[PDB]
Structure formats: C-alpha cells, structure tokens
C-alpha cells in the first residue's frame, strides 16, 4: 500500500500572498544544450508598425524548421547549474524549498479553471529542497501523441516561433547593421537556442527557486533591474465573435499567470488568420489583466467569482500541502487524470529501484557530488 | 502541359536560393509524378554535374519529400533515396565549409522528422562523412 494524499480542487488558502520576484541569475543555452553564465541567447525587442503594414506571412520557413527533445529541454540541468554556482560564490546553502520549472507551476495553478491536459510530476526530496519536474516515461509518451498529432499544431507551434523571430535582433538596434535587420527572414528558426532567467519568490512563508523562457527585453539590458525590461511574445488566431472572445479570455488567463509567476510586466500578441499571416499586434500590461477582464462591456459580471484570487489561494494552499506532506528523502509521485475532475492525486513510490532510478534521472551526478562536497566543507569551516 | 526531360533540365537549371523558385520547381515535379523515375534521373544527373546551385538542389529535394509525405506520396521518399547517399558523395568535394555547416543542419533536420528510414539515416551520416 503506496501512501497517497488528497488534495481537493476546492480549497483554498486565505492567507496566501505572493513575494515580489527577484532575479538572481541566467543562463544561455546554445544548440548543444550546454549552458553557460552570459547574454549570448539575449535578443532584443523591434517592431514598426511598417512591418505590420507589409502583411508578414508565418508558414514561411516551416519547411527546415527544427525541433528539440522534450527530454532534454525539460531537464534541470541549467537551474541546478545556476543554484550550485550561486552557492559556490555564496559559500552556503540557498533558503529556497522548491525548485522547479516555470511551465509546471503554471499547469498545477491552472487547474481549477484550466486543466484539460494531463501530466505525471515526480518529487524529490534531496537535502531538505523539493524538485520538481516532469515524469520521464509520461514524457515519453507526450512525444509519442505529439509525434501522432497530425500537423497543424506543429503549424501553429512554428507560427508562434516565427512571428518571435521576426521581432527580435542579436544585437541592440544602434549597433546593429541593415544586412542583419532585413536578413531575419532567410533566418533558420529552432527552439532549442534560447534564454532564460533564474527568479527566487515564494507564497505565504515559503521561498521558490524557478526559472523560465523569456523571449527578449525591451530596449536594453537593465542590470540594475532586469525583470522590468523583461518581454514575451505570444500568438492567437484573430477574433471574429463572442466565441472568439470567450476562447481569447482563456487564453490571457493561461498567459497572465504563465507571466504573473515571473512578474514580466508587458505582453505582446501577434494577431494571425488561418493563413499565417500577422493581421494586428496589440500590448498588455500584466496587473492590468485581471482589471480588463472583469470590467468588459460586453458581459459586464455574469459571476462575481474572480478566477485570479481563487486560483492564488488555491496555489497557496497547493505550496502548502507540498511543504507539509513530503519529508526528506521521499519521493512521490504527482499526476492528475482529467476523468477525474474532482480533486488532486499525490501518491508516493517504495520500489528502491524506481527511487533510484527517478533520483538519478532527474538530479545529475555533479550535482550531488558537489552538494556533498558543500555539506563536507560546512563542517570543515 | 505534358511532361518532358527537356522542361525539366530547364527548370533545375532555374532554380535560385529565393524560395518562392524552388516551391514553383516543386510543384511542377508535383504535377507529374506519373514519370517520377524521369524526374528523380534528371534531378541525379544535374546535381551531379552542376557547381554552385547544390544546395538549392538539396532544399528542393528536402521540400518535395516533405510534402510527399503531406500528400502520401509513398513511392517518393524510396525514390529520390535511391540515389541520395551517392548523390552526397558526389557533392561533398566541391562543398565549402559554411555549406557544410548548413548541409549537417539540413541532415539533422530530415533526422529528426521522422523522414527516413533508420538504415538510410545512417547511409546518410556516412555519407556525410561525419
């Protein structure tokens, strides 16, 4: 008998408050999933309004358009980079107590109002801090579906890529020269190459290591305070009617709180039709989504219930329940079926060699050895 | 518009690094994929023989074979296939070194689309000769 906890879709925590994001570090992977301390990755944003103007086509390119393994870009490997030389410079043990990816926080705290995808998570209690990530089999059959879901998300999904790329330089604009700003159509686009960002925040009284995507900054690198220049860059279907609006209003919900877990102040959509081709771009601002959904005129309040709020404490209550539920050197395994509907199962795994095996895959060796290391040195101080 | 090796050799002489060339040339191929065995000959003895325009030729071929598989076209991929490895050998000689960097992206490309078969994917990096 495999212990296994609930956790009802209905609660929620009323206390529940979020600190402020911090930036702390960053990392820039190339294509041979090496990552490194530097800006290399870092784009920048521009777009006229004479590109909008000049009707830009998105299917373009999609034939020797590339495509990363879902193992490894879900690996921890960057962040656990990131945490061993903030400690190595640091010289002690970081208070955070979860580290994970962006991506999973924001599916487990859309549940209550977006949960139409299912998904395995495994937990790791290593040193007193729980990791996070996706399960490797559950990953492996997500590939398998993906590689049998036809072709047309695959044309959305290159849409999305190529409409960033079309937006963004290497270089900021003063030193940037007219050959590479108009060459960025002949650009081979992948999604492996990227940049992303290591943010320490947390709910109620506890502190959470994540890191995410981040698309470009604004103009230039602000050192003083990165996250405020910080910008991602999003694809919809253009709206047409209240159906559309309906299905744009999940949308932003997905998106403001794929945002709101980093505190990315601004949002960017690129409006594309059916055929691929950028009609309307428009902003947003992130404190002001919730503001502008709840006050449309075009259905002013049919309930009252703010979905935000409700998905915060539900968060808050989820954090909590992780805290208390897993002590150390305890793996569990975490996944929600979608006939359920009902509630959250978290179950935990006694098959040493499954522990062993889960441990290994998720944490790398260098890691461990190094944190060993670490442990050795505090009681050689 | 009938088919003929003379229309085709003037088409793959045609061929440009702008897409919007190398999707029309695709198309035609498309058009008459009854003679296919004369088009993939055609297409064998002039990337054997051109200079420059190899890796229009490669984009090309990379193109059709995806929209062959788009439109089910099953007998396609064995067919330029049999003479793909060879045709590599012949192209990597006279090939410098940038579009060897784009040749490997491009090869890596097919591999990761689930567009050949695991024998020809590796008759391909040895063809590659990396």
């Given at each position: 008998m495999s212990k296994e906890k609930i956790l009802p879709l209905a609660a929620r925590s009323k206390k529940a408050m979020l600190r402020q994001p911090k930036q702390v570090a960053y990392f820039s992977r190339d294509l041979n999933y090496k990552t490194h301390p530097d800006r290399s990755n870092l784009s920048y944003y521009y777009l006229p309004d004479g590109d909008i103007d000049?009707?830009?086509?998105?299917?373009?390119?999609?034939?020797?358009f590339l495509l990363g393994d879902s193992v490894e870009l879900s690996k921890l490997d960057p962040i656990l980079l990131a945490l061993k030389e903030i400690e190595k410079e640091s010289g002690a043990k970081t208070k955070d107590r979860i580290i994970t990816w962006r991506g999973i926080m924001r599916k487990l705290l859309t549940?209550?109002?977006?949960?139409e995808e299912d998904f395995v998570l495994d937990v790791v209690s290593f040193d007193g801090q729980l990791f996070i990530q996706f399960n490797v089999p559950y990953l492996k059959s997500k590939d398998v579906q993906k590689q049998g879901d036809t072709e047309f998300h695959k044309k959305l999904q290159f849409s999305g890529y190529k409409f960033e790329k079309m937006a963004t330089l290497p270089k900021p604009w003063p030193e940037c020269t007219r050959k590479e700003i108009d060459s960025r159509a002949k650009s081979k686009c992948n999604n492996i190459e990227q940049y992303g960002a290591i943010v320490r925040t947390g709910i109620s009284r506890i502190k959470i290591l994540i890191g995410g995507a981040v698309a470009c900054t604004?103009?230039?690198?602000?050192?003083?305070?990165?996250l405020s220049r910080y910008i991602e860059l999003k694809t919809t279907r253009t709206i047409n009617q209240y159906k559309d609006m309906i299905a744009f209003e999940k949308k932003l919900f997905r998106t403001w709180a794929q945002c709101f877990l980093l505190g990315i102040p601004k949002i960017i959509y690129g409006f594309r039709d059916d055929n691929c081709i950028l009609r309307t771009v428009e902003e947003f601002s992130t404190n002001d989504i919730p503001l502008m959904v709840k006050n449309?005129?075009?259905?002013?309040?049919?309930?009252?219930?703010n979905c935000y709020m409700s998905s915060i404490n539900f968060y808050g209550a989820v954090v909590e329940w992780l805290n208390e539920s897993v002590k150390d050197d305890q793996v569990w395994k975490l996944s929600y079926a979608k006939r359920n509907r009902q509630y959250l199962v978290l179950k935990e795994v006694t098959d040493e060699n499954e522990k062993q095996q889960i441990v290994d895959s998720a944490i790398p060796a260098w890691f461990k050895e190094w944190r060993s290391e670490l442990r050795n040195s505090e009681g050689n101080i | 518009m009938s088919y003929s090796k003379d229309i085709v050799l003037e088409k793959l002489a045609s061929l440009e690094e702008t897409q919007i060339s190398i999707q029309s040339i695709g198309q035609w191929c498309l058009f008459h994929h009854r003679h296919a065995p004369e088009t993939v000959a055609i297409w064998s003895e002039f990337v054997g023989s051109t200079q420059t325009k190899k890796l229009a030729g490669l984009y090309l071929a990379n193109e059709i074979i995806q929209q062959s598989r788009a439109k089910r076209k099953t007998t396609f991929l064995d067919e330029f296939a049999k003479v793909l490895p060879s045709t590599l050998e012949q192209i990597y000689?006279?090939?410098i070194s940038t579009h060897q960097a784009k040749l490997k992206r491009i090869i890596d490309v097919w591999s990761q689309r689930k567009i050949f078969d695991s024998n020809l994917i590796h008759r391909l990096y040895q063809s590659i000769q990396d």
């Amino acid at each position: 008998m495999s212990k296994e906890k609930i956790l009802p879709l209905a609660a929620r925590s009323k206390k529940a408050m979020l600190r402020q994001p911090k930036q702390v570090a960053y990392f820039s992977r190339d294509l041979n999933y090496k990552t490194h301390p530097d800006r290399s990755n870092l784009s920048y944003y521009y777009l006229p309004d004479g590109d909008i103007d000049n009707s830009i086509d998105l299917s373009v390119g999609s034939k020797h358009f590339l495509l990363g393994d879902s193992v490894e870009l879900s690996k921890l490997d960057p962040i656990l980079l990131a945490l061993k030389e903030i400690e190595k410079e640091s010289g002690a043990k970081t208070k955070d107590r979860i580290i994970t990816w962006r991506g999973i926080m924001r599916k487990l705290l859309t549940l209550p109002y977006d949960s139409e995808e299912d998904f395995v998570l495994d937990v790791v209690s290593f040193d007193g801090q729980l990791f996070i990530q996706f399960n490797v089999p559950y990953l492996k059959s997500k590939d398998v579906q993906k590689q049998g879901d036809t072709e047309f998300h695959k044309k959305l999904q290159f849409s999305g890529y190529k409409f960033e790329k079309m937006a963004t330089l290497p270089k900021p604009w003063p030193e940037c020269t007219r050959k590479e700003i108009d060459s960025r159509a002949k650009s081979k686009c992948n999604n492996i190459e990227q940049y992303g960002a290591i943010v320490r925040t947390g709910i109620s009284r506890i502190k959470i290591l994540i890191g995410g995507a981040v698309a470009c900054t604004a103009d230039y690198y602000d050192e003083n305070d990165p996250l405020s220049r910080y910008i991602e860059l999003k694809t919809t279907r253009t709206i047409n009617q209240y159906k559309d609006m309906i299905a744009f209003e999940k949308k932003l919900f997905r998106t403001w709180a794929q945002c709101f877990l980093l505190g990315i102040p601004k949002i960017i959509y690129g409006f594309r039709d059916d055929n691929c081709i950028l009609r309307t771009v428009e902003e947003f601002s992130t404190n002001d989504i919730p503001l502008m959904v709840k006050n449309n005129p075009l259905n002013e309040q049919p309930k009252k219930e703010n979905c935000y709020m409700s998905s915060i404490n539900f968060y808050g209550a989820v954090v909590e329940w992780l805290n208390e539920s897993v002590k150390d050197d305890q793996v569990w395994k975490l996944s929600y079926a979608k006939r359920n509907r009902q509630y959250l199962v978290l179950k935990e795994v006694t098959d040493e060699n499954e522990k062993q095996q889960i441990v290994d895959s998720a944490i790398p060796a260098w890691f461990k050895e190094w944190r060993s290391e670490l442990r050795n040195s505090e009681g050689n101080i | 518009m009938s088919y003929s090796k003379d229309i085709v050799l003037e088409k793959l002489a045609s061929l440009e690094e702008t897409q919007i060339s190398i999707q029309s040339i695709g198309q035609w191929c498309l058009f008459h994929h009854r003679h296919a065995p004369e088009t993939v000959a055609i297409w064998s003895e002039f990337v054997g023989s051109t200079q420059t325009k190899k890796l229009a030729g490669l984009y090309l071929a990379n193109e059709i074979i995806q929209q062959s598989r788009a439109k089910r076209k099953t007998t396609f991929l064995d067919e330029f296939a049999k003479v793909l490895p060879s045709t590599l050998e012949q192209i990597y000689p006279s090939m410098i070194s940038t579009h060897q960097a784009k040749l490997k992206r491009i090869i890596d490309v097919w591999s990761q689309r689930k567009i050949f078969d695991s024998n020809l994917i590796h008759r391909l990096y040895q063809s590659i000769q990396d």
